[PDB]
């Protein structure tokens, strides 16, 4: 439970940008294995992660440090590459979003404090 | 070049830590599809990336910004997740290295 300048950056600059991205829509809520006909999803992916959960954790001061938050973003993208076929459009969508994620993280303010 | 603090950090902290890690050995040279018996590898992975390449690039000041180096690290990990079966040990090794990558990048100095 903390508010830091980096977590505020992650909430208000990084997530705001990814959230509104045209490829973001499959990532804004937990993967719905029932809706999508993916009965194997939870057998392969043991730690589901999505932006909605990350955003809410940012708003409830769940994270102690930015790195904890960056790890959740990473799990979300990693689940997608691991579960899906290489040829699935979702993979290209994740890669596009994760490039922004890394770009924005490179500009994160570096007095880790509050 | 004079080397940005960011690229100095990627070399002296991030690559330092990854190169020597006990899980790093599959990642230190390009994947050898012939040696490993992987006739589909270059069908699926269109942009191979490995630490030897990234390390050489850091040594020779090939990179213009930190984010370009960080992209290469990301491509290397991602190739791995995309190509291999979810249950392969290599995936776990990649996940462990990448967690370190992200942990360190969290503390990387500001640009400019």
């Amino acid at each position: 439970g903390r508010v830091t300048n980096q977590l505020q950056y992650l909430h208000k600059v990084v997530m705001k940008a990814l959230w509104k991205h045209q490829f973001a829509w499959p990532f804004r809520q937990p993967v719905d294995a029932v809706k999508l006909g993916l009965p194997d999803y939870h057998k392969i992916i043991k730690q589901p992660m999505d932006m909605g959960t990350i955003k809410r954790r940012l708003e409830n001061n769940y994270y102690w440090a930015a790195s904890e938050c960056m790890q959740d973003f990473n799990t979300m993208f990693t689940n997608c590459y691991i579960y899906n076929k290489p040829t699935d459009d979702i993979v290209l969508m994740a890669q596009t979003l994760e490039k922004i994620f890394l770009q924005k993280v490179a500009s994160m303010p570096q007095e880790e404090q509050e | 070049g004079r080397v940005t603090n960011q690229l100095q950090y990627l070399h002296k902290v991030v690559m330092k830590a990854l190169w020597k890690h006990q899980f790093a050995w599959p990642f230190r040279q390009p994947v050898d599809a012939v040696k490993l018996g992987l006739p589909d590898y270059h069908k699926i992975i269109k942009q191979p990336m490995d630490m030897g390449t990234i390390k050489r690039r850091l040594e020779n000041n090939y990179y213009w910004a930190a984010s370009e180096c960080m992209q290469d690290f990301n491509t290397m990990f991602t190739n791995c997740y995309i190509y291999n079966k979810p249950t392969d040990d290599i995936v776990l090794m990649a996940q462990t290295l990448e967690k370190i990558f992200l942990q360190k990048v969290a503390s990387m100095p500001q640009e400019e």
Binding site: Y81, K85, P86, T87, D88, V91 | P26, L36, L38, P39, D40, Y41, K43, I44, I45, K46, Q47, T78, N79, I82, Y83, N84, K85, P86, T87, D88, D89, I90
Partner: peptide, 15 residues
């Protein structure tokens, strides 16, 4: 990439 063959490669070996 990763692009070409949808499925999941063939792999390096599991555990």
């Amino acid at each position: 990439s990763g692009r070409g063959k949808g499925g999941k490669g063939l792999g390096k070996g599991g555990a």
